[PDB]
């Protein structure tokens, strides 16, 4: 849910256990909005191929998790 009313996007996670004991949260959500309730929790967000380790700072609070796991590789040209 983008629109301010109805928001924000929420997904079920193993949050409380992570908060108690530093066990990273392997998310395959990528469309869950980051919340104030998880800043300083270690997330392992899916990238299509491999799960990506991220520590959620206070600057990330508005954004989605998938925004920090870049799916495509950085393009180059083989100059032949």
């Amino acid at each position: 849910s983008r629109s301010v009313w109805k928001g924000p996007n929420i997904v079920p996670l193993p949050i409380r256990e992570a908060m108690t004991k530093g066990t990273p949260i392997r998310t395959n959500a990528r469309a869950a909005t980051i919340l104030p309730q998880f800043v300083g929790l270690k997330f392992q967000i899916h990238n299509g191929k491999e799960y990506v380790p991220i520590e959620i700072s206070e600057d990330m609070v508005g954004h989605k998790l998938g925004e920090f796991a870049p799916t495509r590789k950085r393009f180059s040209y083989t100059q032949t």
């Binding site: 009313w5 109805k6 929420i10 997904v11 079920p12």
Partner: protein, 115 residues
């Protein structure tokens, strides 16, 4: 499991069966089954007046609903073949397949567009 592809034992549609068709049909059946419930959950979610905790719970429930409850997941296949491109709704058929049927005279009132 082993004995069936999907959780619920649904019937096969008559005539042309295909894996994709099978997948779609089952999905449609599940949508039909759980249409009212989904609507009710949506209503509970998108409510300024109701308690916020309840709306959150409803939203969570909606999120947790499977692939086969989703209306958006349904895709209109061809019924004669199993194609899913240029599928005309007025005769649930693919473009080429529709034309083939039309020229034969299978369609109830279709004919060459001469002007």
């Amino acid at each position: 499991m082993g004995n069936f592809r999907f959780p619920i034992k649904t019937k096969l549609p008559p005539g042309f069966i295909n894996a994709r068709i099978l997948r779609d049909n089952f999905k449609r059946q599940q949508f039909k089954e759980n249409e009212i419930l989904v609507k009710s959950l949506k209503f509970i979610a998108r409510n300024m007046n109701l308690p916020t905790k309840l709306r959150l719970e409803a939203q969570l429930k909606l999120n947790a609903l499977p692939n086969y409850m989703r209306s958006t997941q349904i895709k209109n296949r061809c019924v004669d073949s199993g194609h899913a491109r240029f599928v005309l709704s007025d005769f649930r058929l693919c473009r080429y397949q529709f034309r083939e049927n039309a020229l034969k005279g299978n369609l109830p009132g279709v004919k060459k567009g001469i002007w």
